[PDB]
Design a protein around this motif. Structure first.
Motif, PDB file in Angstrom:
ATOM      1  N   UNK A  23      -1.245  -1.013  15.699  1.00 62.73           N
ATOM      2  CA  UNK A  23      -1.592  -1.272  14.303  1.00 62.73           C
ATOM      3  C   UNK A  23      -1.412  -2.759  14.023  1.00 62.73           C
ATOM      4  N   UNK A  26      -4.268  -4.815  15.528  1.00 57.93           N
ATOM      5  CA  UNK A  26      -5.505  -4.668  14.783  1.00 57.93           C
ATOM      6  C   UNK A  26      -5.433  -5.501  13.518  1.00 57.93           C
ATOM      7  N   UNK A  27      -4.261  -5.496  12.893  1.00 57.43           N
ATOM      8  CA  UNK A  27      -4.109  -6.139  11.598  1.00 57.43           C
ATOM      9  C   UNK A  27      -3.972  -7.641  11.767  1.00 57.43           C
ATOM     10  N   UNK A  49     -10.177   0.468  14.348  1.00 50.42           N
ATOM     11  CA  UNK A  49      -9.261   0.350  13.215  1.00 50.42           C
ATOM     12  C   UNK A  49      -9.447   1.483  12.202  1.00 50.42           C
ATOM     13  N   UNK A  50     -10.695   1.892  11.998  1.00 51.77           N
ATOM     14  CA  UNK A  50     -10.993   2.978  11.081  1.00 51.77           C
ATOM     15  C   UNK A  50     -10.302   4.291  11.494  1.00 51.77           C
ATOM     16  N   UNK A  52      -7.391   4.365  12.904  1.00 49.31           N
ATOM     17  CA  UNK A  52      -6.007   4.134  12.535  1.00 49.31           C
ATOM     18  C   UNK A  52      -5.847   4.331  11.031  1.00 49.31           C
ATOM     19  N   UNK A  53      -6.840   3.873  10.266  1.00 50.08           N
ATOM     20  CA  UNK A  53      -6.832   4.084   8.826  1.00 50.08           C
ATOM     21  C   UNK A  53      -6.802   5.581   8.531  1.00 50.08           C
ATOM     22  N   UNK A  54      -7.605   6.343   9.256  1.00 53.04           N
ATOM     23  CA  UNK A  54      -7.642   7.791   9.079  1.00 53.04           C
ATOM     24  C   UNK A  54      -6.263   8.427   9.340  1.00 53.04           C
ATOM     25  N   UNK A  56      -3.336   6.967   9.142  1.00 54.13           N
ATOM     26  CA  UNK A  56      -2.313   6.508   8.222  1.00 54.13           C
ATOM     27  C   UNK A  56      -2.366   7.094   6.806  1.00 54.13           C
ATOM     28  N   UNK A  57      -3.527   7.546   6.325  1.00 54.10           N
ATOM     29  CA  UNK A  57      -3.585   8.033   4.939  1.00 54.10           C
ATOM     30  C   UNK A  57      -3.389   9.549   4.909  1.00 54.10           C
ATOM     31  N   UNK A  62      -6.735  11.705   1.096  1.00 54.12           N
ATOM     32  CA  UNK A  62      -8.096  11.645   1.599  1.00 54.12           C
ATOM     33  C   UNK A  62      -8.938  12.667   0.886  1.00 54.12           C
ATOM     34  N   UNK A  79       3.151   4.708   5.635  1.00 56.87           N
ATOM     35  CA  UNK A  79       2.472   4.104   6.772  1.00 56.87           C
ATOM     36  C   UNK A  79       3.527   3.758   7.784  1.00 56.87           C
TER      37      UNK A  79
ATOM     38  N   UNK B 111      -8.084   5.617   0.597  1.00 53.30           N
ATOM     39  CA  UNK B 111      -8.425   7.034   0.665  1.00 53.30           C
ATOM     40  C   UNK B 111      -9.872   7.148   1.081  1.00 53.30           C
ATOM     41  N   UNK B 114     -10.330   6.036   4.766  1.00 50.09           N
ATOM     42  CA  UNK B 114      -9.762   7.067   5.655  1.00 50.09           C
ATOM     43  C   UNK B 114     -10.683   8.280   5.731  1.00 50.09           C
ATOM     44  N   UNK B 135     -11.999  -2.261   7.999  1.00 56.04           N
ATOM     45  CA  UNK B 135     -10.893  -1.399   8.362  1.00 56.04           C
ATOM     46  C   UNK B 135      -9.645  -2.243   8.699  1.00 56.04           C
ATOM     47  N   UNK B 136      -9.798  -3.330   9.459  1.00 59.09           N
ATOM     48  CA  UNK B 136      -8.616  -4.120   9.842  1.00 59.09           C
ATOM     49  C   UNK B 136      -8.032  -4.886   8.645  1.00 59.09           C
ATOM     50  N   UNK B 139      -5.858  -2.425   6.966  1.00 62.55           N
ATOM     51  CA  UNK B 139      -4.595  -2.294   7.682  1.00 62.55           C
ATOM     52  C   UNK B 139      -3.693  -3.490   7.387  1.00 62.55           C
TER      53      UNK B 139
END
Lengths: 142, 146
Positions: A23, A26-27, A49-50, A52-54, A56-57, A62, A79, B111, B114, B135-136, B139
């Motif tokens: 993470x 990526x960030x 990254x998307x 990882x977003x999935x 984390x939320x 969602x 997170x 949201x 994700x 996306x990054x 993050x």
């Protein structure tokens, strides 16, 4: 021009690596995805990254993107909680987005061909000694 | 913060603008994609570099014949893009580009991204695109030091 001369330095993580490292990479590096290898150090997949977003939320958030019926005051705190003690393998989806592999000696058109097949953003160069993004390929021919 | 503060500047090209020029931008700025808009400026689609690569490599090389043909991409590229617009570079079923309202909260944007698992969203304010949130970038905000 060949694979090795085309390739650039992309950070790489193992299946058993810290989810957190991934993470943070990526960030920090503002990358759209990470190259994942297995214990051997041979190509395994790409962790976007998307995804990882999935991970984390919370699902319940969602499921209510406008927050009309649910509350989450703890996004950043959580997170942090759900990365702790978790490996890269857990971040990955059911069917990990495979990672195409070309040789150090492949031609530009050989590379372009493979990339163009999967409409994939990235290929790993092996002899992993690097990677070739789509934009890098475009950069070379132009 | 809101979507407005989260967004970063992202290059945009018109649907009817020159294909070659867009590729020059993808290559130089070293971008995963361009935001494509229509004539009046409304978000339409994203043009990923990878799709440009797909467009440039013929299918008979898609479906090792690469090495059996006396054709070099560098040469061909200008020929294939002459008279061609961004519109023609897009796939037959162009990816939707989700667009979040500028006053959306960080939680809302999270949201959305994700749920949709999208690589980026455009940010709009009063019918104007003011930037994008990848996306990054999302993050980076959620793990930022405080």
């Amino acid at each position: 021009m060949h694979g090795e001369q085309m390739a650039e330095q992309f950070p790489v993580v193992g299946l058993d690596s810290d989810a957190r490292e991934a993470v943070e990479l990526l960030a920090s590096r503002r990358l759209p995805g990470l190259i994942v290898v297995d214990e051997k150090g041979s190509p395994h997949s790409v962790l976007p990254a998307s995804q990882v977003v999935r991970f984390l939320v919370p699902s319940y958030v969602q499921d209510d993107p406008s927050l009309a019926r649910v509350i989450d005051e703890s996004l950043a705190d959580q997170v942090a909680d759900k990365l702790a003690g978790v490996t890269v393998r857990k971040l990955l989806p059911s069917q990990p987005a495979e990672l195409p592999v070309v040789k150090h000696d492949d031609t530009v058109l050989e590379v372009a061909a493979i990339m163009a097949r999967l409409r994939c953003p990235l290929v790993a160069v092996v002899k992993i000694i690097g990677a070739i993004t789509a934009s890098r390929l475009l950069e070379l021919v132009v």
